[PDB]
Amino acid sequence: HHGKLTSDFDNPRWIGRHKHMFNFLDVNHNGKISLDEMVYKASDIVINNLGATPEQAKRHKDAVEAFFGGAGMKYGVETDWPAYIEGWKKLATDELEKYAKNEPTLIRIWGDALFDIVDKDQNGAITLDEWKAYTKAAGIIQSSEDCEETFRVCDIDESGQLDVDEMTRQHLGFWYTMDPACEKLYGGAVP
């Protein structure tokens, strides 16, 4: 056993995982979010908190734009919760096809662009401090204990590096397939 290629869209925990993220993204409790806000947030984090160059920020923005665009979000459009989770079925389906065709997934392309900013050595592997810095700036994780759970789930020691390759596997299983080996990837921060 090496992974999982089947979706699990009727699992209430898959829906609730993305409901948690929709609420985390819906910072003004409008019940709706826009692609404008998603790409603003992405560039706000990497430029203003993580010291990214304009070129790095552009690469990272294009990756985030394509990712939420793959879930049906568009510029100038407010996406409510039912439109969001329905669009995420399409995003997860299109990603699993690329995954199964051994094509670079949208989540992998996002990871490359992000690791080039977060990793000071820029070889595609991040330290535990670098993962704490990214997730706490984004807010997806608040406590350092949850950041350590990421290293436990990726079977990397806390003193080691986290590569895009192992992270992509866990993220595909955490967001797309409900892979039981990827549970607790964000500790207690994300159901």
Ligand X SMILES: O=C1N2C=C(c3ccc(O)cc3)N=C(Cc3ccccc3)C2=N[C@@]1(Cc1ccc(C(F)(F)F)cc1)OO
Cite the active site residues: 18, 88, 134, 171, 186
Indicate which single residue of 59, 61, 108, 132 sits in contact with ligand X (rule: CB under 6 A): 108
The structure tokens 């010291």 sit at: 51
The single-letter DSSP state of residue 176 is I
Indicate which single residue of 14, 99, 151, 175 sits in contact with ligand X (rule: CB under 6 A): 175
Indicate which single residue of 50, 167, 178, 182 sits in contact with ligand X (rule: CB under 6 A): 167
Closest to ligand X by CB, 43 vs 76, is 43
Indicate which single residue of 4, 73, 87, 110 sits in contact with ligand X (rule: CB under 6 A): 110
The structure tokens 């997934």 sit at: 105
Residue 154 lies near ligand X (rule: CB under 6 A): no
29-88: contacts with ligand X (CB under 6 A):
38, 41-42, 45, 64
Amino acid at 70: G
Least distance from ligand X to the Cβ atom of residue 185, Å = 8
Residue 164 lies near ligand X (rule: CB under 6 A): yes
Q: What one-character-per-residue DSSP string does 103-163 give? A: PPPHHHHHHHHHHHHH-TT-SSEE-HHHHHHHHHHHTS--SHHHHHHHHHHTT--TTS-EE
Report the alpha-carbon distance of residue 138 to residue 141 in Å, rounded: 8
Binding mask 131-150 for ligand X (x = CB under 6 A): -------x-x----------
Amino acid at 147: C
Least distance from ligand X to the Cβ atom of residue 174, Å = 8
What percent of the residues of the chain are helix, what percent strand, and what percent coil, each to the nearest 5?
60, 5, 35
The single-letter DSSP state of residue 71 is T
Q: Which residues bind ligand X (CB under 6 A)?
A: 18, 21, 38, 41-42, 45, 64, 107-108, 110-111, 114, 138, 140, 164, 167-168, 171, 175
